[PDB]
Amino acid sequence: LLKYLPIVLNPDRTITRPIQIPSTAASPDPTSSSPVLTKDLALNPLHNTFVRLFLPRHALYNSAKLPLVVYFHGGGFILFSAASTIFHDFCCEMAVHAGVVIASVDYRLAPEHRLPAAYDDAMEALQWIKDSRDEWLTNFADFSNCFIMGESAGGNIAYHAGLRAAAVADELLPLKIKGLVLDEPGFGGSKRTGSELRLANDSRLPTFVLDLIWELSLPMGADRDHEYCNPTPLYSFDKIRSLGWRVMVVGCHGDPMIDRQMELAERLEKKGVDVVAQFDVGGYHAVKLEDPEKAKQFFVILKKFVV
Template sequence: MGDIAAACDAPPAPQMTKESNLFMRIAVHPDGTVTRPEVLLLPPSSSSSSACAVLSRDVPLDASLGTYLRLFLPDPAPPRRLPVVLYFHGGGFVLFSPATAFYHAHCQAMAAALPGLVASLHYRLAPERRLPAAYDDAASALAWFRAADDPWVAAHGDLSRCYLMGSSSGGNMAFFAGLRASRALDLSPAAVPVRVRGLLLHQPYLGGVARTPSEARSEDDAMLPLEANDKLWSLALPEGADRDHEFCNPVKAMPPEVLAGLPRCLVTGNRDDPLIDRQREFARWLRDQGGVEVVVKTDHAGSHASELFVPERAEELFAAMREFVFA
């Protein structure tokens, strides 16, 4: 399985510097609106290629909000039912979509490598729609599966093995979506039972007012420089909130009792990520304060988001996912 990520045409690693960083190129205007840098977008793939045997298609979620899901299915689909992964992309809550080239390729590779039915959510972005708008869209996406009227889900998905997965800000979203799911009561007897078996939290985007050592060292980080990190949180958090708000710093702002009922979690991260101190602290909080079953793999090599561009980093992540999902 080691060549899956390469076979699915992961985009080449950009020659990233602080100056060329996409987050640094977000222009914030005096009226609070932003202009985003342009990125390559890809359509869904109605037929699989020799490079990556995965089909994809878009399905609407809420037309009034402009949200949708991009589904990824191995082709041919295995004869057995596949675990379902609801995926939330990164971008600091401000950038990107399932159609962004590197997230499209990443979800293709994930569907093939697991294998699984992957659904990547196009959620509302900040600052036009600040948090918790993205969390609301994540909850709507999970509710969509309970309708179970999609042919791919009906024919190939095992909704008794559903996983919430996210990277960076998407990892943050997966955590909060998991909290909501653990508290929700399905009162509709006609609903299809959806069992969230676990949360796959890759390099979850977390913060706080006080700097951690890894954050303090990140002023010139190529993938997530400190200035960009500050900018993203200022655009994403509710108006007037500081970075000790629970959406940013749950370890400080949330009582551990809220973790009751949370399913098992996989927390993964890379050693050179400016957020690595937060991620390790978060994993300890889940396990030691919340009593959550946690698998921690936060010693992988690489920078923030390196799995999007480096096939070896992607395969390490997929291997950890397979071990967690099929344990």
């Protein structure tokens, strides 16, 4: 297991996280060297959740507000933080190169807090942002142009948050959602798709690891056709379409979850939702978090999407 996930499974249905995942401290002061300023704001102390804001330095040299991206990190629902270095650095790159202010949500982790805990934290964060008088948000973020985004498990959260938000869109004002960005979103199912068969022996996400992730994340005794795991009447898509939200879906052929991501994109398209799909040859799951060239290329497409 340690070859794939930095966890130990205990004989009491719990896990242990014995390998520290590096984190980066916030840097709120523009006299620092950072090209992006960051600070953490407590969300809910009973859930120990917080939000890290990323404000690109370039925003301090004009009086224009930038679109706001509400972001959810990946990690199988079971690992990582908004302050994990790999996610902090991606968000700093994204802020600079897509020209956005980011609010990255530190949601509760499974199995201590199985789904839907992370989705509830996503909605709490939206409610909190809408009501916020934080000075970075009020002076530099455009509440009228908000995007919900996430990577891997966080893209699953972003998708479920997007469905819930669409149902309460009027209630979220002054925040106006304009789109969803689903970066290699994590979905599953009881039956294997073709890509799950083709990539069963993947070097990072083989079948048994994916199955473990769902086992630890879904409600006890659910199976992988549970709606949190397998997203595909999709009446919700009528609301997305009616609100005029655009949806970006990205992924690559070397990710075992590609077939489900592509099926979601096709179902959205079938329901008349404005979809921007970029599915690439090759790669592997989370390659953009490791490959600065692939990240660079994605930021080109995200900049245009957000504009």
